[PDB]
């Protein structure tokens, strides 16, 4: 009887706060797939879109009459819940996916507006040779008046045309991004750029400025390494790179493989920190697969930095096999 | 042989933007108990709610019953900050739990954080501590009050308290509480409670040991080759990875003695691509040191390592 087919639905319940309104020390999320026509079912949990380890959750399926029911429970620390991460219950049933998401409920009062202004990245300055700076305005209330965002130079010389994006966010706020192309000689020779943000509902105008970092210079050292093969790493292995003793701290790190620049999401790179003596260091970690090194067994860690000579780059290769 | 009832309340979640749904369900669960007479009653600010507002049902599996009751509230009532109590009467005796909407997490822009003990303090020094940090307070009058307690109500020791005004005009308050080694390992919950004169209600943070799976770290240690112009220095790098949970301590040793903490730097734990976390540790060394003895030890202390919560790896310059 195909007329009796009952598709699954998804809802998430959570641990309640106590009689004082306070979070418990751990949070349970309970994904409920109510009565559906019995069939093969799998539940995957996502943390900000990344698959979570199945070890962190349980799952149970019962059948009552002609209908099945499945629940999965995920447990989180209070610290992680307070970090405003979003969790997704992803249900796969007979080749069709359902899902639902949740995060900590929003606070009763809205946050004030904030603004951020970046310097150009070394990769854009020296590889692409098309540098830009970005002014980012967050926590705006939508459906108000549109926000004015104006660029100027301390020298009084003209700015180029910028591009502007406005995007409604899941939490109901608005973000505005403005990206300004800058002259390469202008930037290297110390020009100061300002982003000025105004709106009638703001208390005052917001102003941010940016300019090349002053002070001493020093070129980066680069070292690439591979972890050994062992029973836990037969068809994957971990590569690492240490980049150190450079100044100032602005740097771009990439990994290259078989004439491809790998996506930024493939690796994890730390924030620049001070060496005991002079300069900064960063570490980068890249997990690679057997199919990649069977394609070509050469992985390159590359740093882009203004003091690297002769062409603002330093790089080192590593191989995983003999 | 007897399994008493327990009470827990679950509620409708907010969506991916943190928004409330049109109605709020509260679900009172009495799961896995020796069968007997049972009633579930809901109170709103201590008064019995109409019988038609909730439905209870009971099932049995093996030697144990389970009971649940669901109450539906309007968004407006939930947001009014009323207290809802699930009152369970089993064999004539009463068990209660209560809930209300979660209080703001960053009232007036403040943040508060509460740590777990470091593994070195817990397993090596056997003097574990936890730390409660409150940031972005106003430099107003009226001292910020910070109080410690255990979920079990057992006593706590005195704590430290430190304030200092920051360069940005804010005030941070920090307190560190010593905890019992056995008390922590057996799963006690510790609570930090902060009251400021300008805050409308008390702010609380709670911490306890992890409830997830455990996995010991892998430890790998490397020495940099000589870089042109730096004959008398080398850098040692240690990668520690795939451990769970994320709490970890890192030490370096040379000549059987532990080096001062100021000698090295360790990154904060970050997720791998799959299960577990990694950190990097960095140690600069001198020619005098490796010519004296060319062996340096990167040691990790972690609750999942056996038999003594330690895993380590040595490295040599040559
Ligand atoms: C409602 O929801 C929205 C989101 O949906 C949320 O909005 C976020 O709000 C927070 C703050 O409230 C914003 O966080 C800030 O982001 C700033 C911008 O960061 C991006 O751009 C950086 C600049 O990149 C350019 O320049 C560099 C340098 O030259 C160059 O390398 C680049 O190539 C590029 O050209 C970039 O560095 C950054 O990437 C880093 O950070 C991410 C995330 O941490 C990390 O994953 C990367 O690996 C990389 O390390 C990112 O791409 C940022 O500058 C700013 O940082 C300042 O503040 C923090 C703490 O606040 C300090 O620690 C730091 O030192 C700086 O002082 C801050 O992180 C975030 O961008 C919003 N997200 C949006 C708009 O999508 C609202 O808050 C929500 N509201 C409520 C009420 O809930
Ligand atoms: C004004 O300026 C102040 C600076 O003075 C800004 O305050 C900082 O704000 C940021 C962001 O809000 C804070 O970052 C947060 O820090 C949390 C604490 O991390 C620190 O402690 C961790 C735990 O170590 C303790 O506990 C272990 C185990 O018990 C023990 O071994 C130790 O003894 C320690 O006692 C460390 O892991 C960590 O490295 C830090 O040392 C952190 O947990 C959060 O995730 C978050 O990163 C920062 O701490 C604030 N700094 C200060 C000094 O208050 C403030 O934001 C500025 N205001 C504005 C408006 O910008």
Author numbering:
A (entry chain B): 225 to 253, 253A, 254 to 545
B (entry chain A): 228 to 253, 253A, 254 to 544
Sentences copied from the publication:
It exerts its effects through its two principal receptors, FcεRI on mast cells, basophils and antigen-presenting cells, and CD23/FcεRII on B cells. The Cε3 domain is thus the critical domain for receptor binding. A branched, bi- or tri-antennary, high-mannose type carbohydrate chain ((GlcNAc)n(Man)n) is N-linked to Asn394 in each Cε3 domain, as seen in previous crystal structures of IgE-Fc and Fcε3–4 at different resolutions, and with varying degrees of disorder.
The IgE-Fc structure, space group P21212, with one molecule (two chains) in the asymmetric unit has been determined to 1.75 Å resolution, which is the highest reported for this structure. For example, in IgE-Fc chain B a terminal mannose residue, Man 952, forms a hydrogen bond with the main-chain of Arg342. Hydrogen bonds mediated by water molecules are also formed between: Man952 and Ser344, Ser341, Ile474 and Ser475; Man953 and Thr492. The IgE-Fc data however shows a two-state unfolding, the first event, in the absence of urea, at 55 °C (Tm1) and the second at 64 °C (Tm2). We show here that IgE-Fc unfolds in a two-step process, the first involving the Fcε3–4 region with Tm values similar to that of intact IgE, and the second involving the Cε2 domains. Since the Tm1 and Tm values for IgE-Fc and Fcε3–4 respectively are very similar, the Cε2 domains have only a marginal influence on the thermal stability of the Cε3 domains.
